Design a protein around this nucleic acid. Sequence first.
RNA 1: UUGACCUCGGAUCAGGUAGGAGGACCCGCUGAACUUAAGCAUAUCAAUAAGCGGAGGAAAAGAAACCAACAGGGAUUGCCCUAGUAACGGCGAGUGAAGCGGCAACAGCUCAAAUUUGAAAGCUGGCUUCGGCCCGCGUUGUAAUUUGGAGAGGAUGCUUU
RNA 2: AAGCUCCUUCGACGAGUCGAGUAGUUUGGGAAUGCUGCUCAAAAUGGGAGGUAAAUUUCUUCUAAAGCUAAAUACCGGCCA
Lengths: 117, 88, 183, 121, 183, 50, 220
Amino acid sequence: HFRKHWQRRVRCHFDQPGKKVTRRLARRAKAAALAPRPVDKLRPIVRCPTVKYNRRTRLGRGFTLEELKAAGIPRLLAPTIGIAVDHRRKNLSEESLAANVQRLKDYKARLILFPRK
Amino acid sequence: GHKTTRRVLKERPSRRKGAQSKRTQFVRSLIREVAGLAPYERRVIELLRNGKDKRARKFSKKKLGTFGRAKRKCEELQRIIAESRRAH
Amino acid sequence: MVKWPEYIRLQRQKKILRMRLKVPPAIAQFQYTLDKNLAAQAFKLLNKYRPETKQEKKERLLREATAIKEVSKKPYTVKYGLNHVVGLIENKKASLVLIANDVDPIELVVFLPALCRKMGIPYAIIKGKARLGTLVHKKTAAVVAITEVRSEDKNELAKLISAVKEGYLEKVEDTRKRWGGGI
Amino acid sequence: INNKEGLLTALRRIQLDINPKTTPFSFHQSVVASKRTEDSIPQIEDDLQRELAFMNQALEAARLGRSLLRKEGVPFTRPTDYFAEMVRTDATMEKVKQKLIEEATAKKAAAEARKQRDLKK
Amino acid sequence: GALKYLEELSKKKQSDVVRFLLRVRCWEYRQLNVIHRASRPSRPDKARRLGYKAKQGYVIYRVRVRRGGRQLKYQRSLRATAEERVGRRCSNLRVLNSYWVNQDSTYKYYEVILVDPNHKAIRRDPRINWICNPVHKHRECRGLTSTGKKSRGLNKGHRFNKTRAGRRKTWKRHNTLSLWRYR
Amino acid sequence: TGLTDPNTGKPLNLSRDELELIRKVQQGLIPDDVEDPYPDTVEWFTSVEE
Amino acid sequence: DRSNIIAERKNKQRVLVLSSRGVTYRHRHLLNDLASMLPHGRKDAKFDTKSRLYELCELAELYNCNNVLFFEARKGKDLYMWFSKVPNGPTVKFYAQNLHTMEELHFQGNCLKGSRPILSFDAAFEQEPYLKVIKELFLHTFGVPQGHKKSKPFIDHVLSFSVADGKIWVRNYEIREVEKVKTDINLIEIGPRFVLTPIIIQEGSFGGPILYENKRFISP
RNA sequence: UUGACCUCGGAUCAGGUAGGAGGACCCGCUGAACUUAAGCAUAUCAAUAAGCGGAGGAAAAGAAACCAACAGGGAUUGCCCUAGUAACGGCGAGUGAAGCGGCAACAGCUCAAAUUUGAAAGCUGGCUUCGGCCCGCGUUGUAAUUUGGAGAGGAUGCUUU
RNA sequence: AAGCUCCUUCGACGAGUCGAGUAGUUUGGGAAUGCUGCUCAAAAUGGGAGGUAAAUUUCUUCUAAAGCUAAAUACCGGCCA
């Protein structure tokens, strides 16, 4: 499959050790700004779509509105305390709901909050 | 496949994202009377008043391009004939 | 012979074309405008309800602020603004409507006589979008509406409304549905 | 599900009176063959025999129909002067005539390659 | 709510009042220049929903474009050609959006909305001051307007697999031989 | 070719260029023959008062 | 007299061929091949699948056609047939596969468009009734009435309908004359090749109570 | 006679802006042949090179008229895999994805559609004792409120600057 | 000024745009894969794309024709190392 000019469009990766240093420095640079906070926001536990991966389970994008209200976290506060929020996702079953309001309840137990001023 | 306890969802506010309000239907009925009719709609109205409903459905189909749009246009123009006759 | 400028000729040719073509009966109804007497009697009432200018609104604010350093009813003015007046028409909050006959996108006012007819509000097509703007302290005003007047002149408003449904809307009745122009 | 009596019941309501008692063959021109043609086909993947079976079925239909059509009598065969419009585009027959050229000229040109190598041995 | 009545009117543009208005306006625009300045939009409802505001810094420009084939077909739309000619004429402005305003047997007529990035009424408004940034210089030439996004196929779905992230960027990515270190 | 105004007006006098400009846009704005191209408006919606 | 049949007893038949919204060029060419042969039919395209089945009835009543041949396409890959007597008569559903159209340059046969066919049926089309109902529906769809003024008169082709496994195989051949050695009919195949697998018989026009069910059908 | 309003012009009037360069990478337009198929025209080459237009430190894309058929996922982009699979093919030459999955990074919003109507509440300029005065824009609509997994308005009571 | 709660009150959503036919182009992709030109030209329990032989188009999932936005990605050029 070398019918076209593959010479002009070949990309090597000698920056693979150098990009890893930059990526680890970006995580250190981010943690200097958000010094007591974790680097990454909290994400929900969701089930993979297809029949091939139904039995597996991964992290989603953000918590549903019903999950936040059941846990006791107000919607407009959640992005400001490290909880990602997805308005598109729906619950559609009690098993998806109960797994995530356990996760948010477990987040609140391990969370320490500091007053505003 | 797997059995789960399905929940009942809150009504999505994007249901029927077009028009079902009484205000928009008032505006459309007002604008249609103040603007008049298209040239092809005058042809269909003449045929519908003369009973040539068979020709009118065909003529709206060539102009619009789809049988479903031809039914709706002939339905809308038939209502105009009905409410113009009552006012007369 | 002599040569005329380009925009000069186009002004006259549009005037000929708008009055001599086969005009549909929503623009042709704008050619019929109320009499000189009715327009003068309309502006006799409306000038009594002129909105406050920026100079005298600021003066009144300085009056009330001064008294706070050292009791009124609802203001009755003349309602203007196309988006405002159409809403006042649709909620039946208007009593008399005046429509300019020279709105140059005429689509802004074509539905407006028929919308006032549907809800029953008396309307009158008037000469001058400039005349209405003078009444309401702007350069231009496409539409002018009266909603409620003070108790000293409820009688002359109802008399003016009756002079529109008798002097204007009766003559328009069998000639607002007919096509204009011809030839 | 195969409701039998209701199936023939629906057949009555759309049954034409096709019968040589009154209706001639020119009306329907429908021929039902005696051979099952499933008995003719040993294996359904045999492309040569399967094509021959359907061709054989339309064979006796064509000969029997021709015999009955002359007995009643209609113009059956197109004459030399009926320039009538084909079901296929004329250009389609032009490219299929060109393809029959290419296949047949390849066979004989390969035979010329045989004679050259017959001289070689 | 006058603009809801205008939206239904533009829907019915074969009708009697809209065919009349489009005829008398297309006649007027033919005597005018190829590109000329309009004081107000001919369809104020359409301009406003496309982003037009009655502020110092917003202008409306009307342009006629020849219609027909280039059987070579020009992949550039007539609307994109309308945007590119005006931006050449007004090299100091930014093309925001454009819309159909009229058509004829030879020409197609478009009105384009432009924003002055140097006017400080524009510079102070957070809803529009994104256009003052120099990444928005000549959006009509890079295909960054609504006509450009349609012709570039920037839509979600399996139908737009080749063009949704940039067509040439997709081709360069798929035609790149990628060699790692530990192969 | 002076022709009287259809609204019972007056025998008009416009120039030949003025008459040609009328005929030009009227050709672009004419539905057809036979059927009535310019009917009166039946107020089928504003007859009922809201 | 309006039905343009010049015959002793008029066979008033009309068909309306139709297409779904997602057919392929192979399914589109079978419209063009079948309608060219079929002289008393009208072509129409792109019926809305969001509509109902019985809106194919007043579509045909609009065009005065008592038969309808609907090409319904699913997934953009599968052809499904429908033969139906429009007002109240029975209908059928097939799955059509193994398509080969007239445009493919390998058949080497041709015939007049609008010429009357001979219908070459099979033996199982007579003995078993679920073949008999589609037999009359095939015979009506390709009825080509006697005195039809759009029909070319000389007969040169025969349509062969035969059932082999559980599926009906259509064939078209050209009648050609070669003189006998001291003239016999030699068939050259013209046109469409498809394989027609039955699915249902419904006693209504397009709904109605179910009459035959093919309980061996492997769907694609 | 005067004065508006609209429209079109003039001005070495005041304040601004565009051109050109560079173009490795980026966004559009336009677009070729040899070659391969041991000949050659469909095809390939190649949606490439050359030509034209337009940007930045990145650009472009981007918060579903999406993917899916699930026990569901959830803006965009990039890597690995999917995979030389599906698909299309003088079915020769060959061409050639995407969804799922593991990662990297993560962020959400602004309008138009409403009557502030118990008060154009908004904004550009000029003069300025820098404190606040005029002109103009604008009702053919500038602020505030709202943007459909929403919202408004009342009512009620806690919580926030 | 702001967030939530409740409800004998309301709830507006982008048109010469979809779409139909046709020609060119393009793609692995004749629901045209997409785009463009020409002719005609929409809807409001609407529209789009799917799923399904399952018996009728049952169900599923989103809302187009207005707009902004860092990061992860590219880099034979610019300031350096």
